[PDB]
Design a protein around this ligand. Structure first.
Ligand SMILES: Cc1cc2nc3c(=O)[nH]c(=O)nc-3n(C[C@H](O)[C@H](O)[C@H](O)COP(=O)(O)OP(=O)(O)OC[C@H]3O[C@@H](n4cnc5c(N)ncnc54)[C@H](O)[C@@H]3O)c2cc1C
Ligand SMILES: Cc1cc2nc3c(=O)[nH]c(=O)nc-3n(C[C@H](O)[C@H](O)[C@H](O)COP(=O)(O)OP(=O)(O)OC[C@H]3O[C@@H](n4cnc5c(N)ncnc54)[C@H](O)[C@@H]3O)c2cc1C
Ligand SMILES: CCCCCC[C@H](CC(=O)O)SCC(=O)O
Ligand SMILES: CCCCCC[C@H](CC(=O)O)SCC(=O)O
Lengths: 358, 368
């Protein structure tokens, strides 16, 4: 029996896979998949700026995505919203075209399908790009997922396998381990896993130093809409901004990266920045409906790398600090914590993210 | 006597109220009163704007409405016991380059003849009146007797007042005009009918569209779309209604007492569409951030989009139609909130006396 605290994409995912491996699971979260995971664009390109250990974690998660989704859609009988029709990286000036050559050279060694495109061919793949486009890479095996549909499926699956969901705040950690809930009741389990995003470290009762600081990094994000999709595929455009089309006309446009503590106010400043970026690279998007503006807090860590594994406190694990890439990493995270729970050992691929490194 | 008012936006609630004030019996027909252009409107009340340099008739209409605003609000707040949201702490015009500073000298010269309080301000003094302006500000005029109203609060009061005086509100669409009987009337979506001794049409850009209207009776009141946004802070960010012009176009910025900050507006040709667009919102945000750099931090609380009621020559349409006992009051485009009160008087008088006040003659329907 494992108690998972926080039920965003990371903790739902851990909970599901733990169930898949015969364990008994309880998820504690007053509003599951309501925070960063609700707001997230869920883009899944092969890589990004953010280093070699983390790369190996990502590529593995990438390897696993298709099988993870399929296993899930089967259990839940729900769609998860994973699309694999490719990610397009587009560059708009010398400096960003330079970075793309660097990127190609980074990706080929690792058997990631990449296809360089000249300006002409960038425009043929996406007619809606601005003529100022200079070059681009297509990564046809990459794509995007809708985290809203993914977290819904995870819930359905967790339920189907008979995991419990307690929609209450965990107010305190208890020494077997357990948590106290806002309504006075307690939940203990043979293992506790903390996966509460930027609130993880804040839970009262945690022994000093047990969990590192998971600092919020605010991100505003918007969603445009049209009757039929406007953009052909997940598209990332740099001088940057990313643009994730959904099957139903939704078009996600992210993202600001800001340091504002726990604030999730949508600001004239934020929205203008995003709108400027997207209109710059997709001039026809002017008439697209502005359907939603929103703002989430990315879970950070002191060195900006994920925090997975055992704490100094016995039977108390964590799975958090995924910052900009939790949707991408969710599946590997769920395996690695699975194994950890069952075997008690730490898979090689996760060793670099132990908590004890601080 | 009994007048049926069709449409209950600011113009028609206003007409209905004043008509009641003058002893008449009134029925307002509107499925969603004050939900359209009047719901979205910023409600700015500066002394003038661009449409008035050339139209001396419309200027006179506006100035009269201006004269009347304070008395109209007071009479209303009394009857309704509600606040209407009228603030008179001034409108500030600010210029940000040569070309817009030139226009302001022109504006000063336009306004003095007409006994409108204006006070020119150098860059220094612009920044003292509004600390939040960008350093690039060049010059500005203050019009301390001007200001703004919150149309949402105004239209609520009008409703309360209309009720208090016992006017009827029928929350249904008028589907058809009923013509050629001893008295005029409208048919409603639910099959029922309402006749009255007079019908007044005041349905914005829908006015002309009502079925059963004799051809040519009402001119085309073409929709002119406008997107508009509202930012917010706990305490007001801007001291007063502010209109800022730079690099050829402008933006207006209307603070409310409670932190709301209205930012308008796009002028677009999209028929009846009221979609909020990346394009629209970006335009507005750009303009405001340019002239109020600190507004970056402000919450974006609302984005919205209304349809201004136009007319073939862009002037209001008030008075009798060729159809007997059928009047109109519409076509106020960008300035209906400002004109609402004079509109209400002029239509009042018209209803009671049967004659057309001089100030309104230039806006007769028959001019087409
Ligand atoms: C704008 C934006 C765009 C993004 N785009 C992408 C992208 O394109 N691709 C990608 O891979 N990643 C993206 N991410 C990252 C991804 O969403 C995060 O890494 C992800 O949320 C991590 O999941 P989480 O469950 O740790 O955090 P969350 O989703 O924040 O979940 C934390 C959960 O903990 C719960 N909680 C808090 N306190 C308590 C308590 N006391 N008791 C119980 N529960 C509690 C909350 O209710 C919440 O549901 C993006 C993030 C943002 C903000
Ligand atoms: C973005 C924006 C900003 C503005 N800013 C300002 C400003 O600063 N100052 C200013 O003076 N003005 C401003 N205006 C202008 C002012 O809003 C309009 O001129 C005014 O709202 C017009 O009033 P109306 O009552 O004629 O229009 P509306 O309020 O649109 O009247 C139409 C009404 O008729 C009703 N209706 C429609 N069909 C029927 C039917 N068949 N039967 C019954 N009822 C019906 C509708 O339900 C609606 O309530 C602005 C307008 C916009 C769009
Ligand atoms: C390993 C790929 C994970 C993709 C997330 C990429 C996104 C775009 C980028 O950094 O290029 S960051 C999403 C965000 O947190 O705004
Ligand atoms: C004297 C009429 C004042 C109302 C209109 C003022 C606003 C600013 C301007 O035109 O300069 S226009 C409101 C609109 O966007 O329709």
């Amino acid at each position: 029996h494992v108690v998972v605290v926080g039920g965003g994409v990371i903790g739902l995912s851990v909970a599901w896979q733990a169930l898949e491996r015969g364990l008994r699971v309880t998820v504690v979260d007053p509003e599951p998949a309501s925070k960063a995971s609700h707001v997230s664009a869920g883009m899944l390109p092969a890589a990004n700026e953010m280093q070699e250990d983390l790369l190996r974690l990502c590529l593995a998660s990438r390897e696993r995505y298709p099988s993870f989704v399929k296993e899930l859609e089967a259990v839940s009988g729900t769609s998860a919203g994973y699309r694999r029709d490719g990610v397009l990286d587009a560059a708009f000036d010398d400096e960003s075209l330079a970075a793309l050559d660097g990127l190609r050279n980074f990706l080929a060694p690792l058997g990631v399908a990449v296809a360089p495109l000249n300006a002409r061919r960038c425009r043929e793949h996406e007619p809606m790009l601005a003529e100022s486009v200079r070059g681009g890479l297509l990564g046809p095996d990459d794509g995007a997922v809708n985290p809203r549909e993914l977290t819904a499926a995870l819930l359905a699956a967790i339920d189907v396998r008979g995991g419990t969901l307690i929609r209450r705040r965990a107010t305190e950690f208890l020494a077997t381990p357990g948590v106290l809930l806002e309504n006075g009741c307690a939940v203990h389990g043979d293992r506790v896993v903390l996966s509460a995003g930027c609130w993880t470290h804040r839970l009262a009762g945690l022994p000093a130093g047990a969990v590192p600081e998971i600092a919020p990094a605010k991100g505003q994000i918007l969603r445009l809409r049209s009757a039929a999709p406007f953009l052909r595929r997940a598209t990332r455009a740099v001088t940057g901004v990313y643009l994730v089309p959904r099957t139903d006309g939704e078009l996600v446009v992210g993202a600001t990266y800001e340091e504002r503590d726990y604030d999730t106010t949508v600001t004239a400043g934020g929205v203008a920045e995003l709108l400027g970026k997207v209109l710059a690279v997709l001039p026809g998007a002017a008439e697209l409906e502005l359907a939603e503006t929103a703002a989430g807090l990315r879970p950070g860590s002191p060195d900006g790398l994920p925090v997975l594994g055992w704490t100094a406190v016995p039977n108390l694990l964590v799975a958090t600090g995924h910052s900009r890439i939790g949707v991408q990493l969710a599946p590997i995270t769920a395996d690695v914590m699975g194994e950890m729970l069952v075997t008690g050992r730490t898979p090689e691929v996760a060793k670099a993210f132990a908590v004890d490194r601080f």
